[PDB]
Amino acid sequence: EAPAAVVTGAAKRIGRAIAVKLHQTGYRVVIHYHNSAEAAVSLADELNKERSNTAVVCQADLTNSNVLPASCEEIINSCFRAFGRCDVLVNNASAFYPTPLVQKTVETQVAELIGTNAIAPFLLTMSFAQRQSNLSIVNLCDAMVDQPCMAFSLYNMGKHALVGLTQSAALELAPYGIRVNGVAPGVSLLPVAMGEEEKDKWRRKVPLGRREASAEQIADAVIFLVSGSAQYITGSIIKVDGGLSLVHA
Amino acid sequence: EAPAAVVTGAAKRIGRAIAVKLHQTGYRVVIHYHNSAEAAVSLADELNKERSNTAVVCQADLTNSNVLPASCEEIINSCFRAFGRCDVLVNNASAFYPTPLVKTVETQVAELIGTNAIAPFLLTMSFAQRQSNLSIVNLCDAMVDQPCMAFSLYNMGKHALVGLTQSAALELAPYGIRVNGVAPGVSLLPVAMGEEEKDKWRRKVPLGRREASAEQIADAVIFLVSGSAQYITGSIIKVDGGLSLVHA
Amino acid sequence: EAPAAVVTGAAKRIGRAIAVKLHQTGYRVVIHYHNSAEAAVSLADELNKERSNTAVVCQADLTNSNVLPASCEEIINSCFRAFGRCDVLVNNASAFYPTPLVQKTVETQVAELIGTNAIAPFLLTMSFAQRQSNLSIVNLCDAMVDQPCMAFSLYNMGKHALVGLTQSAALELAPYGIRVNGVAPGVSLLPEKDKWRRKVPLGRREASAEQIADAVIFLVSGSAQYITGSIIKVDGGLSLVHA
Amino acid sequence: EAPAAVVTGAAKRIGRAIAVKLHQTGYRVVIHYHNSAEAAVSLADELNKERSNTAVVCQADLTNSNVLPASCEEIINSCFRAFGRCDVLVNNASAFYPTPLVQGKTVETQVAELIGTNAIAPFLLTMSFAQRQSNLSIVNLCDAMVDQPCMAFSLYNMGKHALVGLTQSAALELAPYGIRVNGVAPGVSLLPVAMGEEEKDKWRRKVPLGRREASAEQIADAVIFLVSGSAQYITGSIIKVDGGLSLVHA
Ligand SMILES: NC(=O)c1ccc[n+]([C@@H]2O[C@H](COP(=O)([O-])OP(=O)(O)OC[C@H]3O[C@@H](n4cnc5c(N)ncnc54)[C@H](OP(=O)(O)O)[C@@H]3O)[C@@H](O)[C@H]2O)c1
Ligand SMILES: NC(=O)c1ccc[n+]([C@@H]2O[C@H](COP(=O)([O-])OP(=O)(O)OC[C@H]3O[C@@H](n4cnc5c(N)ncnc54)[C@H](OP(=O)(O)O)[C@@H]3O)[C@@H](O)[C@H]2O)c1
Ligand SMILES: NC(=O)c1ccc[n+]([C@@H]2O[C@H](COP(=O)([O-])OP(=O)(O)OC[C@H]3O[C@@H](n4cnc5c(N)ncnc54)[C@H](OP(=O)(O)O)[C@@H]3O)[C@@H](O)[C@H]2O)c1
Ligand SMILES: NC(=O)c1ccc[n+]([C@@H]2O[C@H](COP(=O)([O-])OP(=O)(O)OC[C@H]3O[C@@H](n4cnc5c(N)ncnc54)[C@H](OP(=O)(O)O)[C@@H]3O)[C@@H](O)[C@H]2O)c1
Ligand SMILES: CCc1nc(N)nc(N)c1-c1ccc(Cl)cc1
Ligand SMILES: CCc1nc(N)nc(N)c1-c1ccc(Cl)cc1
Ligand SMILES: CCc1nc(N)nc(N)c1-c1ccc(Cl)cc1
Ligand SMILES: CCc1nc(N)nc(N)c1-c1ccc(Cl)cc1
């Protein structure tokens, strides 16, 4: 039978491209979404038009709270309910906004930024492992974590914690045959709210091509990590950043 | 006038040695503690016997919760109320216990990610908002990239603290606040640990086959807050006897 | 036309596996060797039996010396002469032995360890770029570079230098569309063996040269067109394991 | 009896600052130099005027060659010859110039100079320091920007990366001998003498902490900490002294 993957935040942008490319590869997919119901449903319909019964949606808020463990367990359970197995988890969903140190509550910001970027990946990892071929987890990291944007402390803290998770889970889950790796974009699809002049400023920084990564280029690295061509790779984080992280101030 | 410092988890072990050394250097100290009230008060009394009105205690749980921002604002405020200034913040307090992937898990998240990362972040916000050689020192972990098995939430917290160190160094540089870390390998070993297990850790350390004293950790904190470190920000100094360089 | 690749130290072990997989992928290949002429020619015979005139050999000593720049220019030129193009350079050749700090001359050891592991990759990079589509260079790094083996100072130095070359050349050659990346094995083909295997988290799977070659195939592919300056560890998780 | 230190490339700039601060701390010093004879002697005269017989000069080219091991052995021997002991080695001397990958000295001369001064001579001096053997240590002058390198400086960057590898490998292997091995990694400190003020200001404006380069004494302060008793458990560590520069994105 066909393997099955969960992709978080899969309705739009990079998560959509990952879900598409996994499906093209032969996976059945759970399209997790939070607010983007119409886009999630439209994607599942597109994938099911290609092969019936190969895509479902699953709604969840991945903000940290006392029920986040239950929500994460339910996302994994939704893959077993639909497809009878769960071979790949892709932790893609992520909040991003500034949290300046000097002048939503700050605890809501902690819950959203650390919850989506770190705690939900951790809880999803627990539930993936507990509910258990070529099993693997891919975490969407950030190649610029050590040269961060000013005023983004909580986002940066969350992405650093996700590197720690990737490493710790690779070590702990290797005996169960589950590999755990990361893909670290530099700039890929730019923020919807960002003006054209600012987008071009970011583009001009990238050595390879002076352009952002497509979503498909990011997804290409995810497909490699889940493939049989990566069977001895665990704990690794692949930068897909066009050289951006090597550029000095 | 004498500068003042806040040290979190200062009643015992490394945080106690840091508070002692800061005091010996000339700082007035806030000794934060959670459960260890008798040891925090005994330290305060020792330091005030050495020089009157130079130490106070401040109790707080640094577990993450809806009240943690207020608690961290109150720790910093305690230094201003006692001493009229707050020049140094040492984020030392830390929960450490296994969280296997295969207390509720959300309590473990609150304790391990709150003490190791969120409380340092909120303390950093409160310190900066209240603002000469100002600096913050974060107690990191030199083994964060070769972590102990089954310690994912602790490791996640310590990685998040590296990110805070860097992000806060960059954002607080314009205000003249330096932000750095000290990363022990093994220093004071857990008190429950049998000597046979302690000796196994000691044997791994290239430099002397022995754990760091708390005082050796504190010496790196004293350097980073001193005028000999005035250009250092965003740096994490390993104090690990070469342990992180040892392969499996 | 089919793209072409140079693989250094391609007669045996990892380099041989890389050459085979590039050839299977559709590359024409230059098989570099120093001492292993019989194995280089045996490999070329196997590859040419599959597709005629798709594999040649090239002899060079990659020890640093006054003639190393000309040797490296000749390896690159051999690819252009055989195949009319040179799309991929894999810097695989490497010397490995201990050089204790406290007690071949030490300067011969510098020439071999630093020359084969770092300087010849630098000179090959220069010649590859100067003679220039999906162009890329892949350097064989070491996943244990920051947890080095005791008494291997010069080997470790040269592998660190190779990381610096990977990064510096990625930046400088990006405007030319040449990507520069690394693959960092941990324990692959062993030179006591069991001791090492039991420490690898993914130790249920034997380490293989083909697994290393798979990462090289990804990095040279169109699936890696935005990837430059990246070093992929292929080590079963070994570098995550504390002492 | 006062401890003794060797500082390479100590006639001017950062290496002079390091020699001066070690001397102020109580060390006797060997001021190594290559071409800067007048500045080396000037400095040793100043230090000797402060306390007699506490500074000597030693001349040596640190370019790689088949004689480099003998030169490095001789530098260490000069410390024992003058002072009877050698407690600290500071590997400061360093060539720096561009070596573009795509197109005067031959490339092999550039290799010998850039990799010799930045890496091979530190390795040979480390071997001779250890063989000739309490608070013994080595400090290597690294570069905080080694992972965000300047365009066209590949050989310099390769040499600094190799020096990180040496720092770590020598820390591990020399720990049983009680010799600590650490690094200090400037971002921008004293700017090139050839650089125009406009270009210097471009660099200064990038630095978060103060929008200025490190003084030479700020770099020396980190060296003095690492050789001190306050660092007695620290080995294999590289301290950035960079004002936050390495944290700044493109
Ligand atoms: N784009 C880049 O250049 C870039 C650069 C560096 C790293 N990355 C990483 O790559 C991944 C994909 O980036 P992207 O730009 O495609 O991300 P994005 O568009 O900013 O976010 C992806 C999705 O995350 C989901 N999400 C946000 N908050 C959530 C919450 N509270 N609960 C559950 N889901 C939530 C949202 O789903 P709904 O729309 O359904 O609400 C959203 O569509 C992220 O991890 C990002 O950090 C991207
Ligand atoms: N010891 C080592 O070898 C070592 C190795 C690597 C890193 N480090 C780091 O170095 C720092 C000091 O280490 P240590 O061994 O001295 O630490 P420790 O003894 O484990 O803990 C220090 C103090 O943290 C406070 N703490 C724990 N949970 C708390 C909470 N919920 N709220 C507030 N405070 C809390 C406790 O204060 P009360 O007693 O008052 O409750 C405790 O005494 C830590 O950050 C540790 O991670 C140490
Ligand atoms: N095996 C592993 O586990 C492992 C681990 C970490 C990193 N790596 C990296 O992976 C790559 C391939 O490793 P491997 O074990 O397959 O290497 P290997 O067999 O030790 O050597 C590869 C080839 O390099 C060539 N070589 C050595 N010294 C030379 C010189 N002076 N001039 C020219 N060529 C020379 C030799 O070719 P000839 O036989 O023709 O003379 C040799 O067959 C290396 O860069 C290595 O450092 C491997
Ligand atoms: N300045 C900075 O901003 C900065 C930034 C990053 C790293 N660093 C590192 O910090 C250290 C000191 O920097 P600096 O700017 O003071 O260095 P520098 O002025 O460029 O060079 C220091 C000395 O190196 C000696 N040297 C050069 N080539 C030599 C050779 N072939 N043989 C022997 N000695 C040789 C020269 O001695 P003579 O004059 O006697 O010939 C020179 O005075 C260097 O390792 C540098 O890489 C500095
Ligand atoms: C808002 C898009 C976004 N979402 C998430 N989850 N993470 C990010 N790192 C970004 C991001 C992308 C490009 C730039 Cl230039 C800045 C931030
Ligand atoms: C329990 C002491 C402790 N507390 C905290 N906060 N962090 C740690 N990293 C440790 C610790 C020290 C030595 C060993 Cl061997 C293991 C863990
Ligand atoms: C001789 C094989 C070899 N050659 C080179 N060129 N580099 C290496 N790192 C090794 C190697 C492989 C396995 C072990 Cl355990 C140690 C070293
Ligand atoms: C020429 C001074 C110099 N010498 C050496 N040995 N290394 C360096 N890294 C520099 C240097 C300092 C500042 C700038 Cl901006 C650029 C280079």
Residue numbers in the entry:
A (entry chain D): 2 to 104, 114 to 142, 152 to 268
B (entry chain B): 2 to 103, 114 to 142, 152 to 268
C (entry chain C): 2 to 104, 114 to 142, 152 to 210, 217 to 268
D (entry chain A): 2 to 104, 113 to 142, 152 to 268
From the paper:
The structure of TbPTR1 in complex with the cofactor NADP(H) and PYR was obtained with a 1.34 Å resolution, providing a detailed view of the inhibitor interactions within the enzyme catalytic cavity. The crystal asymmetric unit includes a whole functional TbPTR1 tetramer, whose structure is highly conserved compared with those previously described (subunits were completely traced apart for two surface-exposed loops including residues 103–113 and 143–151, usually poorly organized in TbPTR1 structures). The binding of the cofactor is essential for creating both the catalytic site and the substrate-binding pocket, where PYR binds through the peculiar π-sandwich between the cofactor nicotinamide and the aromatic side chain of Phe97. The PYR amine moiety in position 2 (atom numbering in the inset of Figure 3) donates H-bonds to the Ser95 hydroxyl and backbone carbonyl groups. The nitrogen atoms in positions 1 and 3 directly interact with the cofactor, forming H-bonds with its ribose hydroxyl and β-phosphate groups, respectively. The amine moiety at C(4) donates a H-bond to the Tyr174 hydroxyl group, that is further H-bonded to the Asp161 carboxylate, a key interaction within the TbPTR1 catalytic cavity, playing a prominent role during catalysis. The ethyl moiety in position 6 forms van der Waals interactions with both Phe97 and Pro210. In the binding mode adopted by PYR, the 1-(4-chlorophenyl) ring is rotated by 74° with respect to the 2,4-diamine-6-ethylpyrimidine ring. This rotation places the 4-Cl atom in an optimal position to establish a halogen bond with the indole moiety of Trp221, pointing exactly to the centre of its five-membered ring. PYR fully populates the biopterin-binding pocket in three subunits of the tetramer (chains A, B, and D of our model) whereas a reduced occupancy (60%) is estimated in the fourth subunit (chain C), in which the population of the cofactor is also reduced (60%, consistently with PYR).
